[PDB]
Please model this.
Amino acid sequence: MRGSHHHHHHGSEPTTPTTNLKIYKVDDLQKINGIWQVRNNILVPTDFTWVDNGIAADDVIEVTSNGTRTSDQVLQKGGYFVINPNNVKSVGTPMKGSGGLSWAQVNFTTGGNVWLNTTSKDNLLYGK
Model:
C-alpha cells in the first residue's frame, strides 16, 4: 500500500568472487516431505531427519565435479551439489542429533528450514 511498489532487476555481468560455494556430496537423497531431500556422508553420514534435517534438494543446486552450478537443473543423489546461497535465507543455529554431531537449521528458499551437519560453516556455503 504505502511505498510498497518497487520493481528491480539483477545484473547479467557478475564479477569473479572469492567465496565460491564448493561442492556438496549427494550421498543420499529421497523424496522427503513432498520435496527431494539431500544427504552427504560429510554432513549426513546417515539418518538425515527427513522432517527438516534433510535438505530439500529443490532449495539447492546440483553442481558438477568442477563445481558447475545447475548443470542438469534436476537434482539427483549420487554425486555432488551446491546449495544456492541466493535461495538461501540464512544459516541457522546448530543442534546435535543426527548421529551426535552438529546439525544446523539453514533457512532455504523452498524448504524454509533445512538442516545440515553444521560441523562447519563453510559446510553449507562450501561443503566443509
